[PDB]
């Protein structure tokens, strides 16, 4: 996953928007990759970062974690710089056995995408209805 | 949200498998739909569970939570022992406030579908080649 | 009361408005039904929910409770998303004996509607005058 | 509010009964009108009481409270014993702030009159068939 | 397993009666679902109650249960409630180990319904006559 | 009243299979009518046993006890003689008072068969789907 700029799309309710994730770098002090759209004023921007966690003396498994930050930045007309008055997010953790293969890990990755793209979760997220 | 049979296509590293979930009833303590996999034993494998919390606690926010359970077998016995041994799994939480826009929630959802289609996230999971 | 969408009307001071209550679902963790108009941004919306309480080892009777939420959502022109700066409500509890019949329960239900629709309460609610 | 004789028509499961209340005086401790039912003994049955609180406590809000008392008899004795035994009742509170709009208060009131006319609330009370 | 309205038929001594079971939801502290009868008075109802339990450690097995059914109502010399005595009861549970087949489960369910219909039990139960 | 061979058709998931119980006399330990499946191995696996008792001094209630056993044997890798690994069964009882008669017994056993055949129990048992 050697970082490179990737444009993501089919975004939003209609699946029409795109976003661009430009690597900013990888933070060596915590094992976290970071890419963003824009970035002139980071507080106001959408960001995606990924942690890397390997098996260890105190870790039974390894992880890939994606942190998704989606702020809403507002200012009233007549004023200056906007500020974030909402922070929307997602927190995606993948966790796997050291004896697991690519196909099995991929099932979890693609099951997630296929299911989040399915009505059960589309409604759980857009309508926020109780499972029912 | 509303539960109905879910068919998930284009699954796995090849993008060729199909999974079928059966959301047949919601847990009274956790608000969790049991998305059983099709097949009496396979149902326990590749199982997913889903709950949508309400802003009923002093956080004043809510979370849509999907838990993906993918334990797998290693060589079942003639005694009808499934030999389930190893496991892959994921925890994905969304992680919004009460004033959030449905469109923004949709972006977060579709952005993840897009991230799961990108080498920046895929290589780190299927080939376990992290960001750099 | 198998939930279905119902339009309510003769609403407001003149008895002219209507509202639509679309089931969102029933929360199995607390026995509470929920329906609303709209819902894209739940904090800002009118909602009606109903609890169900049955006789028990620690309950002498059974109840039907209706919770009515009527927020006032405001933003100033030139800004963004409105927020609620008023929460108006009603809390309606019905409670009955296990030996009571439908007619008796209906008397309480229709007595309430007939009386809330009568000047004694119309003025108690719109004018907020002391009983006098 | 202002008290005068109240006639409530279209009462009961059939919508055919008429009740008559007599709001003849307000309780000095609770601010409660005694809406006596017509008839010296029937007055005690199907009795309703009403009070409008003022924002005189550190809540800075107020409540219109109506209490419906519908105890009923089972087979009076020749000794002139009314045999009142079983009871149906309701407590309805409105539950507004000092800055509320009269129109919004009217909506809450009329919305309840409308809810009491809907199967979503009726079936749960008259047939005791709750939401689902 | 959505606990929606259930209609039964072809029942009673001559197989000619019908019954609609109207669910009232599930007890939050007891996994058993309950379904209401057509009677107006709760104290007189013959409620159907149902549960599916799926244990892990402590039992490592599965259980499904239904509770049946009715107290007998009557009056004599004047009353208050036409009161009921439990007279007609049955209790059916299903039990099996983990990882069972759906066909195995189906046979136990269908075998019982067939056994109940069969003369050896349908007449033996009516008469309470041991089969020898 | 009499012991007889039982043929049960239209059973199993598809409602098409037939099971046959060969009579096996009486067990005078408990007054149990023992019947078992008509085959060399089913004789060892699959069986139904039944007893009926009048009230004991500790009941004032008649009892019917039906035990349905449908275990599955598996052949371990090294066995010649397969044995039961999955002991599936059902526990079926009835209880009636000393003043109950034919209709009380009839609606219970016929309502039970109707319940077993209902879509709620078909799904609750065959799939093990909780009624939520």
Numbering used by the authors:
A (entry chain B), B (entry chain A), C (entry chain B), D (entry chain A), E (entry chain C), F (entry chain D): 1 to 132
Passage from the reporting paper:
The coat proteins (CPs) of single-stranded RNA bacteriophages (ssRNA phages) directly assemble around the genomic RNA (gRNA) to form a near-icosahedral capsid with a single maturation protein (Mat) that binds the gRNA and interacts with the retractile pilus during infection of the host. The canonical ssRNA phage Qβ has a genomic RNA (gRNA) of 4217 nucleotides, from the 5′ to the 3′ end, encoding the maturation protein (Mat); the major coat protein (CP); the minor capsid protein A1, which is a read-through extension caused by a leaky stop codon for the major CP; and the β-subunit of the RNA-dependent RNA replicase (Rep). Like many other viruses, the CPs of ssRNA phages can also assemble into virus-like particles (VLPs), which are not infectious. Through a native infection without engineering the amino acid sequences, we found that Qβ CP can form diverse VLP capsids, including the T = 3 icosahedral, T = 4 icosahedral, prolate, oblate, and a small prolate form elongated along the 3-fold axis.
Recently, T = 4 capsids have been observed when overexpressing the covalently-linked CP dimers in ssRNA phages PP7 and MS2. Here, we have observed under normal wild-type phage infection, T = 4 capsids are also made, albeit a small percentage (0.5%) of the overall number of particles. The elongated faces of the small prolate consist of two triangulation numbers, Q1 = 2 and Q2 = 3. Figure 3A shows the five forms of the VLPs from the wild-type Qβ, each containing 240, 210, 180, 150, and 132 CP copies for the T = 4, prolate, T = 3, oblate, and small prolate forms, respectively. Though all of the 5 forms contain 12 copies of the pentamers, they consist of 30, 25, 20, 15, and 12 copies of the hexamers for the T = 4, prolate, T = 3, oblate, and small prolate forms, respectively. For the T = 3 and T = 4 VLPs, both are formed by only one type of hexamer. The T = 4 capsid has one type of hexamer with a θ angle of ~170°, defined as a “less arched” type.
